[PDB]
Structures are given as structure tokens and as C-alpha cells.
Amino acid sequence: QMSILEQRESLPIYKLKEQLVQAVHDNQILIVIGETGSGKTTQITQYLAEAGYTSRGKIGCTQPRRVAAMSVAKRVSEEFGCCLGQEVGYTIRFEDCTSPETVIKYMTDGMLLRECLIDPDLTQYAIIMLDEAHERTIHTDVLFGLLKKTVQKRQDMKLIVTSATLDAVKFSQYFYEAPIFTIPGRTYPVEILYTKEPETDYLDASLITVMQIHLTEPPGDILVFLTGQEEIDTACEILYERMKSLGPDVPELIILPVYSALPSEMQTRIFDPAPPGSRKVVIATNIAETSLTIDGIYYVVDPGFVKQKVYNSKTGIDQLVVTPISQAQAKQRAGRAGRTGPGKCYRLYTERAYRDEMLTTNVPEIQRTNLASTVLSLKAMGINDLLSFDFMDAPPMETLITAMEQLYTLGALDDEGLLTRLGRRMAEFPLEPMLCKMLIMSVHLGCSEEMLTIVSMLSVQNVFYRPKDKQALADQKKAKFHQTEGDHLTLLAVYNSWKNNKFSNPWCYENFIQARSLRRAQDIRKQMLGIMDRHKLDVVSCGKSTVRVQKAICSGFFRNAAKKDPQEGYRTLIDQQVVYIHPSSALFNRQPEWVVYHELVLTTKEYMREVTTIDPRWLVEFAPAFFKVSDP
Ligand SMILES: Nc1ncnc2c1ncn2[C@@H]1O[C@H](COP(=O)(O)OP(=O)(O)O)[C@@H](O)[C@H]1O
Ligand SMILES: [Cl-]
Ligand SMILES: [Mg+2]
């Protein structure tokens, strides 16, 4: 109702409070099932803290995304009555908002995985809650295996797994036929509306649908499912313009973006109720399917797309791609319009496309991703017999062999498949293996000062400010930073000139650089420097000898080597695929014979992102294992 306490007592889980703490008391492992918004994430930790479980250790609860971990920790600290970071806190990659006071901790799946490396028995925890398998992430499958082992060694610890009705028995059977606790909940009818014919521009169709709902449908807030941040920011801008073009005699539409890189002040706005005579539209990614729960939503706009990872078994390369959602996802999206009353779901696709062009459920992430990082993490924990690891959704044998082969050519593993000194040092950093490799190699190549900066700059969102109205001016400002040897050295030049200008916000404004992004890289750099210092890895500058930087990049990213094609674009060394230097690259107007790129991004063309010029001789010098029978 009105107060926080009344709001907490109106949640479906409240009716089962006593029986829930009794079920936890009676069972070491409990599978918890309940409709999204029933209070599983926010209340279970509080119920158990009240029952006295924090006296024995921390209560940890995993979250799949940054915005979810931050959002729930903030809400739970308000309900608990403490400071965020004190009794209730959160941990995400590069941001640990916890203290010696923390008894309730929300963390990303990846952060719990990093704690297992330090302490495989998770001795600091009395309770571990593994919050769902919304989409069965690699981290969920890995944490299930690690905690099935932890539960055997630790008879005192409690394990709570939240689940979907369809997954509950599979999770139960996995956890030694663990009991299932069901939170009954009211689900309301959702009118499902399909398009008569397929829509070309799903972004335009979704904006048209939002405006039609707003002006002609009874009060209730709208939830739009888009594919990413850039798309979301674009949707918001166009909708704002379109709504303003209607003039002042039109009811207010509160346009609210939702993405994992969202500033916290904008995150709180999505939970605020709309004032009378106004309506809000929440433009979100698939975080809004199960992770974030907004009250007052009665309308869902479903264009039918998710950005997910697709793996190539032959090349061993994975890539983010926009594909249709599974039917299970369509059902989850529609269900968001039926939580507090009957609602409507506008599917921007035909009924035939739902029944024929959509998979029932998606393939689990562990079966369509590169597993080099997973294998490196597992080997760092002493798990050498990968065939013995009890996975719920088993990865293909080919993917595990490809992962081993990749780490071996990186120099992380030996012939027997055991970690080398290199692999061990690589495992100490919360980074992708090719990034770890170039950082440890920069120590031996005498450019770790530069590499700490480059790795930190590569770990942040675009630092170049490019407003739609000042695109030509933005490019001229950026061109001043352009280094002849590529994008990585341009990132280094941006950071160093910012440092040399005493980390000035006005300098950033003048040069069209995002100060927030540089402050994030600065913070990441300090944390990476902390790991280097702990493990006595020397921090050395190359000075003017930036060829050392290029070699270190090449020692990690040789797999992404590509040679300039005489006709157009480039051809990858690995599979002779046609790839291109992006128009935003420092190398766009000075395309060299050989390059290495950070990643491939599919837009209109298959574009290389973050390109550095290389000498092909360095491929033999830094990746000799990666080359079969040639002379020269
Ligand atoms: N940051 C937040 N601010 C305000 N309310 C929130 C926040 N995060 C969650 N809530 C509210 O908490 C309630 C309980 O949700 P939750 O614990 O996430 O349920 P479940 O985990 O079962 O899906 C929801 O009705 C939701 O609106
Ligand atoms: Cl209560
Ligand atoms: Mg939840």
C-alpha cells in the first residue's frame, strides 16, 4: 500500500513468509518457484536475515545484470533501513559496493564465480541464493556445478535456487531431487495482438504503436522491448520529437530508457509512478523480462528480437547478433502486461511467424558460445578433468576441445592441458583471455604502463561524443587524436592528453570526449594496477617506442589478424572472411596491409572494431603454435 512496510506485506511471497523460512530450515537445498514480481529477490534475503542466518555468515544472492544487482540492493537497503553498501550491498565487475558491515549481498553471476576462485567453499556465506535461469547463462551452468560441489563439503550452508515452472523439476533433479517451494500468484489475461503482415522497420512500428496506445488506450504504463542501448537512445529521441510535434494540448508521455549502463538517477525514475494525466513508456532490453519489475505496466510492445551470442564450431569464434526471440521469451514479454491487472501485448510480427519462425525455447548459452574464458576459470580452480565436471546443460565436446586449443596457442595451457605461469597470471584478471594475454605480455615487452590504459579504455563504452546534429564537428575533434598505427594507440592518446590536461571536464567538452567514460577507465586502470602490484608484475613505459604496444596487442589478438584485400575490405587469416575497417576507425583513410582487430561487429557489413596495424612477422613470433606447415 502507501508505506514501504505495507508495500512489502502486499507481495505474494508475504502470505508464505513463515512456511518459506521453515522450508529453508528443513532443507539444505530449496528450489523456489514464483511469478515475476512475487518478491523472491527482494524478500527472501530479508526473511532469512530476520530468522538469524546472518549471524553465521553473509547471505549472497546472484543477479544476471548490473542494473538488476544495483536496483535490488538499493530497494532492499531502503526496506532493511540501512545505507546502501553497509548492511545491504552489491558487487559487480569493477564496482564493489560492500563493506565489513555487509550481511546481505547482491552480486552478478560473474562476481560469485570470481569468489569461487578465491574460496571454492564460499566460507564467508551462510546462504547462497542462485537467482533463476531466466535465460540459462554460461555462469548459471558453471555456478550450478561449483555449488553442487560446495554443498557436499559444506553441510552448514543453505542453497536456494529460484526457477521458472518449466525448469523447476530439472533444477530439483540436478540438486539431489531438492524440494520445490511454490509461491502462488495472480496472473491476469493478456490480449495478444499480432500484425496482419510483417513490419519492415520494427523501430518505427514500435514508436507508432506506443503513440497509438498512449493517445487511444485507457491509462496504464507501456513496456517496449528493444535490442540495445544505441537503439534505445535513438527510440527515445525520435519518440520525444514525435510527441513534441503534437504540441502542448497533448497528455504527457514520460519516456524512460532502460539499459545495463544506465546512470543510477535514471534507474530510480523507472520505478516512480506517473503523475495523473500522464503516462510512462519504459524502453528496455530483455532485462525487463524477468530481472526488473515495474508496477503499473498494462501494455507491452514486442518487436520480437534479442541480441544474443552465436558461435561458429569450425572457426571457434562467437559473436553478438540480433535474432528472433524464442516462444518462451514471447510468453515472458506478454506476461509483463498481466501482473497487476488484465493487459495487452502488441506483437510486431504475424501469428504464423510466432508458431513457425520461433524456437520453443532458446539453446542454453553454454551451447552457443566460445568457452576459452570458462575453461581458463575452471582450470584456475583446479578443475582439470573437464569431462568429469557435472554440467546441467553439457557443452559440445568440440567446443571444449576448441577452447583448450585456443588457450594453448595463447600460451595459457601446456601439452597436458595444465595452466602455465602465463595462464595463472591471466586468471588473476577479470578480463577476456586475449585482453589478459596482451596485458601480461606488455610486462615482458616493456609497455605495461600503456597497456594498463589501453585495456581500461577497451573496457568502457564509446568515449567519443558524437551528437546527431554535430557529427561532422565531432569527427574533426576526434581526428586530432588519430594515431598512424591505429585505434588502440588513439585510445591511449585520448587518455594521456586528458591526464596531461589534469583530468579536466572542460577539456573533454572542448574535445567531444565523454568525461564519464574516461572516469570509468581511470577507475578500472587503478584496479588493474592493484592486481599487477599484488603479483609483482612490473609497470614500465615504452616512451616513444610504441611498436612494443603493437607487438603486445598482436600477442593477444593474432587470432583476429586480417590482410588488406586488393579489391575491397580485408580477409581474415583464420577463415578468409571479408571484413571491413569501420568509418569511425583511425585507420579508415590509411588502411594498412595487415591488421589485428579487437572484435567483429555485424551492422550493414561485418566490421572490425578497434584495428591496429601489425607486421605479419609478429604472427610467427607471438603465435608459433597457431601455424601448421609453412616456411620462408
Ligand atoms: N529498485 C526498485 N525500486 C522500487 N521498487 C523495486 C525496485 N526493484 C524491485 N522493486 C519492486 O519490488 C517488488 C518485488 O519484486 P521482486 O523481489 O523483484 O520479485 P521477483 O524476484 O519474484 O520477480 C516489485 O513489485 C517491484 O516493483
Ligand atoms: Cl515482513
Ligand atoms: Mg527477481
From Swiss-Prot:
Keyword Phosphoprotein part of the UniProt annotation: yes
Segments carrying motif DEAH box: 131-134
Residue numbers of the full-length protein present here: 555 to 1186 of 1220
Keyword Phosphoprotein included in the entry's annotation: yes
Source organism of this protein record: Homo sapiens (Human)
The protein's role, per its UniProt record: Involved in pre-mRNA splicing as component of the spliceosome. Facilitates nuclear export of spliced mRNA by releasing the RNA from the spliceosome.
Helicase ATP-binding domain span: 21-184
A cellular component term, taken from the record's GO annotations: nucleoplasm
Tissue: Expressed in skin, cervix and nerve. Also expressed in the brain.
Principal subcellular localisation of the protein: nucleus
Name of the protein in its database record: ATP-dependent RNA helicase DHX8
Designated gene of the protein: DHX8
Domain notes: The RS domain confers a nuclear localization signal, and appears to facilitate the interaction with the spliceosome.
Positions that bind ATP: G34, E35, T36, G37, S38, G39, K40, T41
Subunit details: Identified in the spliceosome C complex. Interacts with ARRB2; the interaction is detected in the nucleus upon OR1D2 stimulation. Interacts with SRRM2. Interacts with CACTIN.
